[PDB]
Amino acid sequence: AAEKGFKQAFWQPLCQVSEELDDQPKGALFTLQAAASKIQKMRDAALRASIYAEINHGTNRAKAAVIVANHYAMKADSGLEALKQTLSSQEVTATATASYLKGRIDEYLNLLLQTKESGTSGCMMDTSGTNTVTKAGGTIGGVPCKLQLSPIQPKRPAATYLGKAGYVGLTRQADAANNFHDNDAECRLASGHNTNGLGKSGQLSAAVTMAAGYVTVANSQTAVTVQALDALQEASGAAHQPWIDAWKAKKALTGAETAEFRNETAGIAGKTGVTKLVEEALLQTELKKYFSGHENEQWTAIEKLISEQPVAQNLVGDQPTKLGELEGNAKLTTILAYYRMETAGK
Amino acid sequence: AAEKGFKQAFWQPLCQVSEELDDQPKGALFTLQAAASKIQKMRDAALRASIYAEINHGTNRAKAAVIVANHYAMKADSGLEALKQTLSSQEVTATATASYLKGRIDEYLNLLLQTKESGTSGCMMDTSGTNTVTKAGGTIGGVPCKLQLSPIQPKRPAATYLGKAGYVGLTRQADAANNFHDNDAECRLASGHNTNGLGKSGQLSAAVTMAAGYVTVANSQTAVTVQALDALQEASGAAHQPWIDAWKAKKALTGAETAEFRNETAGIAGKTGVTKLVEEALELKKYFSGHENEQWTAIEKLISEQPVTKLGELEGNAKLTTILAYYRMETAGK
Ligand SMILES: *[C@@H]1O[C@H](CO)[C@@H](O[C@@H]2O[C@H](CO)[C@@H](O[C@@H]3O[C@H](CO[C@H]4O[C@H](CO)[C@@H](O)[C@H](O)[C@@H]4O)[C@@H](O)[C@H](O)[C@@H]3O)[C@H](O)[C@H]2NC(C)=O)[C@H](O)[C@H]1NC(C)=O
Ligand SMILES: *[C@@H]1O[C@H](CO)[C@@H](O[C@@H]2O[C@H](CO)[C@@H](O[C@@H]3O[C@H](CO)[C@@H](O)[C@H](O)[C@@H]3O)[C@H](O)[C@H]2NC(C)=O)[C@H](O)[C@H]1NC(C)=O
Ligand SMILES: [Ca+2]
Ligand SMILES: [Ca+2]
Incomplete structure (x- = not known):
């Protein structure tokens, strides 16, 4: 009532x-x-690729790893900008x-x-x-x-x-x-x-x-x-x-699901940063020289080589040594700096 | 009432x-x-330092820049952890x-x-x-x-x-x-x-x-x-x-005022990441001509004045990342 x-x-x-x-x-x-975590995973993948390129400097796969590293670094950068903006x-x-x-x-x-x-x-x-x-x-x-x-x-x-x-x-x-x-x-x-x-x-x-x-x-x-x-x-x-x-x-x-935080499935030429880097630093033709192809299958093959790359065992705890088994931005950054010190000495 | x-x-x-x-x-x-912006500034300084080291690869100044780059990269990494957590x-x-x-x-x-x-x-x-x-x-x-x-x-x-x-x-x-x-x-x-x-x-x-x-x-x-x-x-x-x-x-x-987002005035050996890197990889006088903050800022000036027009005038993470990747490609040439 x-x-x-x-x-x-x-x-x-x-x-x-x-x-x-x-x-x-x-x-x-x-x-x-979650957005921060995805940025960190992008940064980790960039760091693993840069470490691989430092360890294997002067090979075609190292130059492939530099392209991979730049890609994931730009993914990490864009995620942070999207978090901010x-x-x-x-x-x-x-x-x-x-x-x-x-x-x-x-x-x-x-x-x-x-x-x-x-x-x-x-x-x-x-x-x-x-x-x-x-x-x-x-x-x-x-x-x-x-x-x-x-x-x-x-x-x-x-x-x-x-x-x-x-x-x-x-x-x-x-x-x-x-x-x-x-x-x-x-x-x-x-x-x-x-x-x-x-x-x-x-x-x-x-x-x-x-x-x-x-x-x-x-x-x-x-x-x-x-x-x-x-x-x-x-x-x-x-x-x-x-x-x-x-x-x-x-x-x-x-x-944390917009494109900045998501990994890209396009062919190599279509991945963030790839075409411009190949233009400025090296100049489809240039890509087959380093990935042996230009599709995602060849990109995955380089990431597998990166992930299976061991680092010097003095750099980790008495701990696995393959890059794919290591995680943490600060930890991988200090490992990269170690290998950049070795590279400079050469 | x-x-x-x-x-x-x-x-x-x-x-x-x-x-x-x-x-x-x-x-x-x-x-x-503001926190995100400070992380980005740390990352820009880490990138400028790395670019300087790629350009001058083989000199003690470049080794100092590797130390500087590692410092600012760790600051940016730690800022993201503090923002997150x-x-x-x-x-x-x-x-x-x-x-x-x-x-x-x-x-x-x-x-x-x-x-x-x-x-x-x-x-x-x-x-x-x-x-x-x-x-x-x-x-x-x-x-x-x-x-x-x-x-x-x-x-x-x-x-x-x-x-x-x-x-x-x-x-x-x-x-x-x-x-x-x-x-x-x-x-x-x-x-x-x-x-x-x-x-x-x-x-x-x-x-x-x-x-x-x-x-x-x-x-x-x-x-x-x-x-x-x-x-x-x-x-x-x-x-x-x-x-x-x-x-x-x-x-x-x-x-955004905690240490993760802030630059450090401590002597070089006390700056984030420096001692662990010096221990594993390599004393600081061989690259900074000293171990006090004044010698750090001296190398920072060298980094900022390095032409690519000057690194100190370039900003933005993605921009400086692609420049660094260019010079890493150039290094792979040797
Ligand atoms: C932590 O400290 C780092 C070092 O101080 C910070 O990185 C610095 O960031 C500033 C601002 O972004 C940069 O300073 C720029 O320098 C250029 C070059 O200046 C010189 O040349 C110009 C033109 O010829 C002249 O006018 C000046 O007087 C100088 O002679 C300026 O043009 C810019 O306006 C700006 O002042 C530094 O280069 C940069 N240093 C390094 C090593 O990267 C970092 O941002 C700090 N972190 C945080 C979170 O604040
Ligand atoms: C975007 O994709 C990349 C892969 O291209 C992601 O990085 C990858 O992260 C996974 C898991 O963290 C790593 O997998 C590892 O593989 C080894 C293989 O033996 C395995 O033993 C490990 O336990 C682990 O599963 C992989 O190494 C790593 N790849 C690279 C190149 O670093 C990245 O995390 C993705 N981004 C996001 C936001 O998810
Ligand atoms: Ca009733
Ligand atoms: Ca009344």
Whole structure:
């Protein structure tokens, strides 16, 4: 009935959203670290190729390794530029809009949770409208709903309750009076009228929106209305703008999956840096001299020779010595510097 | 008087915090981009040094440049590790904690702003408790108070209302009934009692906390209580924990100022990577004519003045990488 406390069908979808927004900072941290990890892997492959060219200086495969090294160095460089120019902004913006929306939702839910008069009458009711619900650990009436920002550790990004089209569980409600409102639980937050709602001497001046514009609370003895947020489009200045902002920011996320962080499958001439390096330093013809071909199969063969190349065993722990079994930028950089010292002495 | 709407002395301090928290994501973006930019500068110096060594391969100056290149390459590598592991965690945490707290505050303020019966009776009152305030643009009753998360662009945040000690404006209130509550504006959010407040058939079961535990609304006919947040201590499980979390996360920020992102003034033997390289590969006087910072900067000058027009005038990682690859090809000629 209008003006009565809210059964679980109303607030559980909000808990689900709040819980998923909690994971957006975790996914931002994951994505920033994943992008850094991919850069480091590119740099490692550049370092292995440069080491191979130092060890085998003066051979056609060494000159092939210089081309490989330059390629992966440029991949590492472009990943860092994309981290600076694009990913940083995307992940900060998703973290901020999601956390801000979660704060707006959680303040509303926390208010509902506390606004009660007994075990059977209050603003936050169970599925049948029988009892008011209580918070125990991170659950409310058995529903995961911490109403707090969890400690932030990296976690893979997931879009379940908030996805490409909007908030999947926040659909249009045709009969709020029976599906959201209980029959008898008293809740002054359910209405702006003064008899059973927020008004004191008289009705509120206007409708009041709550939870960042999700629920509209009339100043009359009528049921609430909710926004349908499951099929969103861009908007400005909406009463529910924080919902749109978080959706837009999450939708923009590309992760560490753009071309800068991905390895290239094209033929050798089409790989980053190859053609220009062959032009400036050496000038299809020049490439078969060093890869014995110009397709990805020959590139893979050079990478295999690079990976199987052992380094001097004094350079590693008492540890494998093949370059493909070594990882870590700083470690491979210091090995390259060792071989550049040897090269200079010659 | 107890159970009346809130004068500006109550909510303007919350606006001031809400506005300042708005810029914490901007500081996170600023710091992350600045860190990346510093890594790129380290890598440029590592590349210039390597190019110098390829051009002059066979001289002790080139051996010095190999040492220099290794140093800056390791600095760039270490900067990426710190960005990945420390700065990203710091700045995401400051962004999340400040934005979350700002949402808690803004929802509460937005509720007060709308809960009114007239131009003179409602939950959000002006300084003298005469008028209910209205929101126009980014101000409420003339107070900066957008109640929105602004578009995120790089910016260094203020530390006026949230600083090292806490929330300076959120001090203990000795007389809320007269300083916070108006004398006659009606506001059911000021109390949990049923006559003038949130209760319907009777008073609410318990006191209600609002604004992430900042304000406690009694279920009796008494004035609100507020938490003093101006001299915080690290705690957990507090009713006002979100305030603690954002204070701690902001206070923990170093910016892109840790050693990984910064050049070193130590003597050459103490610079990153130098001793390990000298030990394995090879004394510093044979290449730098000394072992103090002055001899390091001397070699850096030689590197910067080397024509390719001068290395010191070239910048950009990918550009300098392709130049280095050209001279490595040239070396492979010999
Ligand atoms: C860590 O320290 C490294 C060494 O200081 C930094 O690398 C240096 O970066 C600066 C700025 O990018 C470069 O300085 C440039 O030098 C050129 C050449 O200057 C000379 O020639 C011009 C023109 O004839 C003349 O006007 C000058 O007075 C000089 O006589 C300038 O044109 C540029 O404006 C700029 O000043 C250094 O060359 C470069 N050094 C090395 C060894 O690469 C590094 O960026 C620092 N790291 C961080 C993160 O800041
Ligand atoms: C882009 O592709 C390159 C390969 O062309 C990746 O570098 C490669 O990384 C793998 C795994 O880290 C290395 O594999 C190693 O192979 C040996 C073979 O015996 C095996 O024993 C090792 O346990 C390991 O599996 C491989 O050596 C290395 N290749 C080169 C040339 O360094 C690179 O990581 C890729 N980039 C990204 C972002 O994934
Ligand atoms: Ca019922
Ligand atoms: Ca008054």
